[PDB]
Amino acid sequence: NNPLFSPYKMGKFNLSHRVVLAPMTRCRALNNIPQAALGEYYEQRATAGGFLITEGTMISPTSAGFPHVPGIFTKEQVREWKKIVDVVHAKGAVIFCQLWHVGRASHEVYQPAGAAPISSTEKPISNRWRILMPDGTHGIYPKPRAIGTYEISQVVEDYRRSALNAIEAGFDGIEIHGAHGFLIDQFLKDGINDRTDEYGGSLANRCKFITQVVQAVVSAIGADRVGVRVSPAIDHLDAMDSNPLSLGLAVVERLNKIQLHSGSKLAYLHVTQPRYVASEEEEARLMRTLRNAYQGTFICSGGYTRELGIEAVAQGDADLVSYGRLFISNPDLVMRIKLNAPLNKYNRKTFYTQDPVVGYTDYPFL
Ligand SMILES: Cc1cc2nc3c(=O)[nH]c(=O)nc-3n(C[C@H](O)[C@H](O)[C@H](O)COP(=O)(O)O)c2cc1C
Ligand SMILES: CCOC(=O)/C(=N\O)C(=O)CC
């Protein structure tokens, strides 16, 4: 009896197992347009009753910090996503689109007119980190432009419109990327957010942006079609908080309150294990504390294996387990976990390259 293969009711969606495709930027969506290669890639990994989360997807022309990542802010993008969603649904899978704004984790080369990226702050990511450039070299993260509250409201509207576009494309739902030092995390983390207005200072103020984003998408598409990803403790892009557990619990409280207000539960809360990068006990403590505090479905992610995923579900630490790197190199990861079959190695060199086949769809099945 493998606990990963017991069914699970994720709100309206009846899942047949607990193995989730974690959202992974792969950079094959040339010119920000979903391509046929994405259809092949997601189709390979789809299973009947399995849940897939897409690569981060742009909500606006200013939201990108990687090359050739898809958007869902134009009608052309919606039309191409629909073809991908249809082939995934034909396999019986459930698929959510992750909505992603990078904030300050960008570069002039990724911005319209070469403008500065936006953030909560004018503080740049430090020179300890370098950004992948379209030519494969690495560049300098620039100083971002700190946005005012009118512009904050327009970014919230970008999330809302992108959620509606995702539904128009046929997605079952969306995930808010609120993790990993990206735009939402630049408001959450007190190591980044140095604002003195209503969006900074107190923990309550720092949580305002994520609350408004989640509220907007819930109001647009329904809470049961909205997942939220956060990472209160993460070593990525200078995104630290002085009190990660209290930050996490404050976010959880806002989500619990949104659910009570809306009269419905979110699809899930998705949290990255602090071990994941691009004390072992304090890390598991943080995860279980957030799970125990949240009134709903919990997806854990970051460094999971077959054994660690089985343990997480068996022990009640998570309802669903998302896998990233092993899903890159094992299109049939679900079946391999079921059979306890050996897994293929992954090649980091082709994680972010543009080839529609090599290192993308050419990892073999059993
Ligand atoms: C190539 C790659 C791209 C990723 N892109 C995203 C992304 O777009 N959005 C996101 O929330 N996480 C992203 N992550 C993190 C994954 O969703 C996931 O949490 C992580 O890979 C899980 O750890 P694992 O690889 O040990 O399974 C990415 C990870 C990898 C390896
Ligand atoms: C290390 C935490 O950050 C991530 O996992 C991530 N996006 O969220 C990427 O790596 C983008 C390619």
Residue numbers in the entry: 9 to 286, 297 to 384
Q: What text does the study give?
A:
To assess if the introduced amino acid exchanges affected the overall structure and the binding of the oxime, we also crystallized the tyrosine variants in complex with selected oxime substrates. The protomers in the crystal structures of the tyrosine variants are perfectly superimposable with the ones of the wild-type enzymes, confirming that the exchanges did not lead to major structural alterations. Interestingly, the binding mode of the oxime substrates also did not change in most of the structures. Interestingly, the exchange of the canonical tyrosine (Y190F) did not have an observable effect in this experiment, indicating that fast protonation in the active site is feasible, likely via a water molecule. On the other hand, the canonical tyrosine variant OPR3_Y190F showed a 2-fold increase in kred and an 8-fold decrease for the NADPH Kd. Though a parallel 2-fold increase in kox is also observed, the Kd for the oxime seems not to be affected by the mutation, indicating that the canonical tyrosine residue does not play a role in substrate binding in this enzyme. As an additional aspect of the crystallographic study, the structure of XenA with 1b might explain why only XenA efficiently transformed substrate 1b, and OPR3 did not.
The biocatalytic reduction of the oxime moiety to the corresponding amine group has only recently been found to be a promiscuous activity of ene-reductases transforming α-oximo β-keto esters. By studying the crystal structures of enzyme oxime complexes, analyzing molecular dynamics simulations, and investigating biocatalytic cascades and possible intermediates, we obtained evidence that the reaction proceeds via an imine intermediate and not via the hydroxylamine intermediate. To gain more insight into the reaction pathway, we determined the crystal structures of the two enzymes OPR3 and XenA in complex with the oxime substrates 1a–c, either by co-crystallization or by soaking. All the crystal structures obtained had a high resolution (1.9–1.35 Å) and showed clear electron density features for the oximes.
